[PDB]
Design a binder for this molecule. Structure first.
Ligand SMILES: [Mg+2]
Length: 477
RNA sequence: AUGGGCC
RNA sequence: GGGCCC
């Protein structure tokens, strides 16, 4: 995005500067080059002179203004993707009720009750519970008044900036590159679920290459589906953006919202409006009040879907801006927000697409480090998606998601107080696909201290998950 | 202390 | 209630 004006205001907003993450018994063993992100300006692990505030917002470096020709091309790509999207999903995108928006529906989880309320409720000292009844799915007088203001389209707000407390690479911690969460008001989140929650539920149900979205997927089982798909194509590309979310130019966001969320596709007129309120935002970080134009605020509501949609349109745009006669069937892809895997039988020059992405404000690089630029001849087993490689299970013959051993080590090195036993069981579900030997090594430090699931048990559970009838068939002997 | 999924 | 990924 682009920082248009920063101001100092009396109403302070205390950002939390104290990590919940602590080292584990594995930290001594593995010694990862990872650590909790710096949450304080006076963190000793930082480098001298590093001001944590100026680094956080340095991602905002401009709002790329697209030319008329580029904007016209983008709309055609947005309309063409929207056409494909609503062909698969349908046009049953009518507003969710207040009840269904809170409680959720099949395909869409319920709203989190014990989480940040946003502004100006945190200032006033009232949490989500006081404003919204989550059991019965009704709302108090505060939210209901705000809900009507959004119908009238005279609702302004501020995003509350939280520091994201997480494990990050030591290079990023030393640099002061802590990620941030833009906490919007709970009513904005509710109303956004009202306008497009049906659509969102629908995209979770229909995740896959046909719509180019993995939001809603279960890597455990869906890796078989995605793996076999991308194996059929000659070339595959693992593309990486830098600061994807921030570099969504306002022009692109507006066009996308105009083309995807039209009334003729079964949406409410305010579906576009509420989404367009994300383009120009005001962020509240302590005494600072930073107005921003461009980019997407994380923790919005449909941010994964919105980013994923934009990702699809970018590829169609970039290819159409370099090659002639490109349709959606010229290539295939799957994305989860900024994360993206693309494939095609055509020998597409992705190196030559680089400057065409810079017209949108985005900067693309190959996920592979050593190779100097994009190259042809890569397959699905070379790339990475959702932090997982595509490996073949030689026992079942299915594809399985394998995370790098360093990532698993780093995960296991840190944990919140009194949640380690519950975390170990969760992490085992990921680590199982690394193989019996690597699995045993990963959980070596915890033996005796905690309960560790057997490789056997998690493997058998997985086989039933990917294909139930296969598991019963394996009982032939 | 997080909308989005996902045992 | 927790974890993973975005
Ligand atoms: Mg990638």
């Amino acid at each position: 995005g682009l920082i248009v004006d920063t101001r100092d205001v009396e109403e302070r907003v205390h950002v939390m500067r104290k990590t919940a993450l602590a080292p584990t018994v594995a930290h001594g063993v593995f010694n990862p080059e990872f650590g909790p992100a710096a949450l304080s300006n006076k963190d000793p692990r930082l480098n001298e002179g590093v001001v944590l505030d100026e680094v956080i917002f340095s991602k905002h470096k401009g709002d790329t203004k697209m030319s008329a020709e580029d904007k016209a091309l983008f709309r055609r790509c947005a309309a063409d993707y929207a056409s494909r999207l609503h062909s698969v999903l349908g046009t049953a995108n009518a507003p969710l009720s207040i009840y269904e928006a809170i409680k959720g529906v099949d395909g869409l989880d319920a709203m989190e009750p014990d989480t940040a309320p946003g502004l100006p409720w945190a200032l006033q000292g009232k949490r989500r519970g006081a404003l919204i009844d989550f059991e019965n799915g009704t709302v108090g007088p505060e939210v209901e008044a705000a809900l009507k203001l959004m119908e009238k389209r005279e609702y302004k707000f501020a995003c509350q900036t939280f520091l994201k407390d997480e494990i990050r690479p030591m290079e990023k911690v030393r640099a002061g590159k802590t990620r941030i969460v833009d906490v919007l008001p709970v009513e904005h989140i509710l109303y956004t679920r009202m306008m497009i929650g049906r659509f969102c539920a629908q995209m979770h149900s229909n995740n896959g290459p046909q719509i180019g979205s993995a939001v809603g997927c279960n890597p455990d089982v869906d890796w078989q589906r995605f793996g076999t798909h991308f194996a059929q194509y000659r070339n595959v590309w693992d593309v990486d953006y830098s600061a994807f979310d921030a570099n969504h130019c306002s022009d692109a966001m507006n066009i996308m919202f105009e083309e995807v969320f039209r009334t003729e596709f079964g949406f409410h007129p305010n579906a576009e409006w509420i989404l367009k309120t994300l383009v120009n935002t005001e962020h509240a970080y302590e005494n600072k009040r930073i107005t921003v134009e461009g980019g997407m605020p994380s923790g919005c509501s449909a941010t994964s879907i919105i980013n994923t949609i934009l990702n699809n349109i970018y590829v169609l745009y970039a290819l159409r801006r370099h090659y002639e006669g490109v349709e959606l069937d010229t290539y295939t892809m799957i994305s989860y927000g900024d994360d993206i895997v693309v494939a095609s039988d055509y020998d597409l020059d992705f190196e030559a697409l680089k400057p065409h992405f810079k017209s949108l404000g985005q900067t693309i690089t190959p996920a592979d480090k050593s190779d100097k630029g994009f190259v042809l001849g890569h397959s699905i087993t070379d790339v990475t998606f959702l932090k997982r490689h595509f490996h073949m299970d030689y026992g079942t013959g299915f594809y399985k998601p394998v995370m790098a051993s360093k990532t698993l080590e780093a995960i296991l090195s840190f944990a919140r107080r009194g949640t380690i036993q519950e975390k170990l069981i969760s992490v085992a579900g990921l680590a199982v696909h690394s193989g019996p030997d690597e699995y045993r090594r990963l959980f070596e430090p915890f033996q005796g201290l905690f309960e560790i699931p057997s490789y056997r048990s998690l493997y058998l559970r997985w086989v039933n998950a990917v294909c139930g009838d296969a598991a019963a068939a394996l009982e032939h002997h």
